Amino acid sequence: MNIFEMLRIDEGLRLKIYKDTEGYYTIGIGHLLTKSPSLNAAKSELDKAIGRNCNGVITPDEAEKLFNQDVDAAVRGILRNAKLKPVYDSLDAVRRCALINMVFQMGETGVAGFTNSLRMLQQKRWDEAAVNLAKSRWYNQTPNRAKRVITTFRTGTWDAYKNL
């Protein structure tokens, strides 16, 4: 199991514009287009991102290309981030994947706001951090995915996704 398979499980794959859990215009594999209410704002961001007139629809290939960019931008974002880098460096390969997952979903900024949890992960206090991470809007809004991520941090194994 790898970061790409993990996120493919968490986000799904949709080839036509859609609304994400938050009501935002998304496409592909969790690719946020715009937080704006306008479907036209969406198709516009869309064509701009793909470089063609897509009219709300993309191919599998385009969806994957976007997925590649997003994952890459998530990893470099963590690496350049002064709050995030130290945590990432301190983690093992699987828990690394879990933080990447969070950054992909909530952006760098939102993850860096989880101060206390970050502190616990860095200290390798797994159970403590699991319980702290669950006390968030994140967990309340998307509990099944949050739990899967939390389990990944708690155990350091892919058990949660082995199921799926």
Side-chain angles (χ1 to χ4, degrees):
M1 179 120 318
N2 64 51
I3 192 59
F4 292 96
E5 295 163 343
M6 187 200 204
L7 277 159
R8 168 86 185 55
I9 286 174
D10 283 342
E11 299 287 351
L13 165 73
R14 309 200 215 166
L15 297 188
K16 176 92 228 296
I17 295 183
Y18 81 96
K19 298 183 190 191
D20 91 358
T21 73
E22 296 284 11
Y24 309 132
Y25 284 128
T26 304
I27 204 165
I29 299 139
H31 184 82
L32 174 75
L33 283 169
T34 180
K35 296 183 185 179
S36 120
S38 172
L39 170 76
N40 277 312
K43 302 137 105 106
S44 177
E45 281 304 315
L46 174 64
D47 291 333
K48 146 157 94 82
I50 290 325
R52 90 198 171 56
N53 240 77
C54 303
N55 171 47
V57 182
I58 67 173
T59 78
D61 280 30
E62 290 174 340
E64 260 146 25
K65 175 140 206 147
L66 293 174
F67 191 29
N68 284 145
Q69 301 171 165
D70 296 352
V71 169
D72 183 59
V75 184
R76 292 186 282 95
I78 284 163
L79 297 175
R80 270 198 270 111
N81 190 295
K83 260 99 198 225
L84 302 174
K85 189 185 169 4
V87 180
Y88 189 89
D89 294 332
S90 80
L91 299 173
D92 54 275
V94 181
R95 300 186 172 88
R96 280 173 181 179
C97 289
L99 196 63
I100 293 162
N101 194 298
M102 289 187 73
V103 174
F104 183 90
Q105 190 191 354
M106 107 188 61
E108 199 179 319
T109 307
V111 174
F114 282 65
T115 290
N116 300 323
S117 308
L118 299 175
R119 222 194 54 253
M120 299 174 214
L121 292 162
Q122 228 201 302
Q123 310 173 26
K124 308 198 187 267
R125 280 166 203 238
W126 316 130
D127 282 42
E128 308 84 317
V131 158
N132 190 258
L133 275 163
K135 296 176 174 139
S136 56
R137 183 199 195 267
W138 174 59
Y139 182 83
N140 284 93
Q141 290 319 116
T142 40
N144 299 148
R145 157 173 198 173
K147 273 178 199 139
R148 291 192 294 280
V149 177
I150 281 146
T151 289
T152 302
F153 277 129
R154 206 179 28 91
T155 74
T157 82
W158 295 105
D159 295 349
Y161 287 85
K162 281 169 169 167
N163 257 53
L164 285 19

